[PDB]
Design a protein around this ligand. Structure first.
Ligand SMILES: [Cl-]
Ligand SMILES: [Cl-]
Ligand SMILES: [Cl-]
Ligand SMILES: [Cl-]
Lengths: 172, 172, 172, 172
């Protein structure tokens, strides 16, 4: 490569794996949103919430792939596994699955940051700091806030709570 | 002092104590608002309500200190005690603690007004009448209104009520 | 905590201590500004300079507390000590005290950055880099610039110099 | 009188005396301003400062006389003594004479407020609180601020200081 400088094969490979993780997360969110669009589920705000995240995770994959080319690494794509479930339960089940997914992405980001640090790759470290680490902290805080409000609304009137949360917290 | 006229040492000292009370109240409100911002509490309207009051109480301290200098008294600052609690319970617990705090500030204002009256200090009396006494009556009425609505919403579905009050009465 | 990830108890505790340091600094600046507002001091530009810093340090405390909740740590507030002096001397004395205060805040920021680095907490390190370290370097440079101009103006006409600096460098 | 209610002869007489005091103060300020307009004094900002106060004191007399008629009292005018000096010395001498004058007006206001209080005349007490007491406190604080800045500028270069104060603090 005519441009590659200070860009380890270890980082290059980890960036390709992280792209696979983001595209898998986008796919998971596509499935979550279409479940909430079912006529027998019908929670529009929940569908919109997950479809926005499907878009955000596609955009994160695109940013990683752009950076891979800016550094002179080579994008390599692998098969994308299907999401973990075909049906996603309640809004509470779905938001618990989303927080699990986001904490897995966050740990992958932190692992790649630590590899970059070990490789003395400050451009990689800055790139994750600037475009990924705070976006993930903010999203996980928002999901935790939502989980608390969903849990408070269960009581012994779960249907009522699930409707009110979708109507009065999520966007429709 | 070149400007001091009709300004007793008793009033000067009581104004400094009242400043300490207002800064303590601001601190209490800072803590109340950050509790409601926790991911395991997550009541944005409640956080906003208390943070606005933290600002209002800072502004009251600034107005007192400005008046102290306008009269030729000397601002003296003391240590600020931390708030009475680290965790504030439910919205109902927090609004009960806030009304207690506001009635303590109101009694301090009335005490200082009575001292000013005894000292034949009409500028001090006017100052409290114009900038503090009605603001306190209005705030205490608003808190009492909120307490009644929160209490009505407890029923036997406390979580539901707490969510609805934050969504439909407070600003988010 | 449902959101906490990669957030050490050491960092959590150091963030709470840093909040106390920022609120103490805000209080110091409140006292500095009210001293310059005295009818027997009467340097409006100096009062404005310190009151702006009191606001900036309150805002830094709020940003730290917001981040503490975003990471799933728990805000804990302690008593706030009163400022070190009741009267602040000349503009030169006050700007020397301010530079001492700012270098203490800067060292606390650098200490917390080093703890974050040792704890492999890149979100904390980025957070300080993005919102605190350069703001502190810029403020300390501005204070050093002011100190040089104040010192140049003392000569053997100190009152004249103190007036001219407040009129022609500070904002009124 | 068809309108007079709760308006003592004592207050009526004291309001007429206070009108005389305000018109005397206006006259004093007219003389102060014309002294500073002399070609051998030539401090335009000082002339403007005093002429604005001559206008303010005329307006206070007009407000008192309007209130006297609103209450059903009878305006009675007496001779107006000339000002205490024909020449007013330095800006410092003049601002010291002005503070003395303002403290005499302030004590007259406070005396009339106390008479109103003794006479259970709350409209009179409110009237002074609303239109006179804080205006006087604010003006005396401004004059004290000016006195400190003038004093700081004397040094051993009095002419220089007097010019700089008129140029950089007063309005021309
Ligand atoms: Cl699979
Ligand atoms: Cl305590
Ligand atoms: Cl202390
Ligand atoms: Cl005479």
């Amino acid at each position: 490569s005519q441009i590659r400088q200070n860009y380890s094969t270890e980082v290059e490979a980890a960036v390709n794996r992280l792209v696979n993780l983001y595209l898998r997360a986008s796919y998971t969110y596509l499935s979550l949103g279409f479940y909430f669009d079912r006529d027998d589920v019908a929670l529009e705000g929940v569908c919109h919430f997950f479809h926005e995240l499907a878009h955000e995770k596609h955009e994160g994959a695109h940013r990683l792939l752009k950076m891979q080319n800016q550094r002179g690494g080579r994008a390599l794509f692998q098969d994308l596994q299907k999401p973990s479930q075909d049906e996603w339960g309640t809004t509470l089940d779905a938001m618990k699955a989303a927080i699990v997914l986001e904490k897995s992405l966050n740990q992958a980001l932190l692992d790649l940051h630590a590899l970059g640090s070990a490789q003395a790759d400050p451009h990689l470290c800055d790139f994750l700091e600037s475009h990924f680490l705070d976006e993930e902290v903010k999203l996980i805080k928002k999901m935790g806030d939502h989980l608390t409000n969903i849990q408070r609304l269960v009581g012994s009137q779960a249907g009522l709570g699930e409707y009110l949360f979708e109507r009065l917290t999520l966007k429709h």
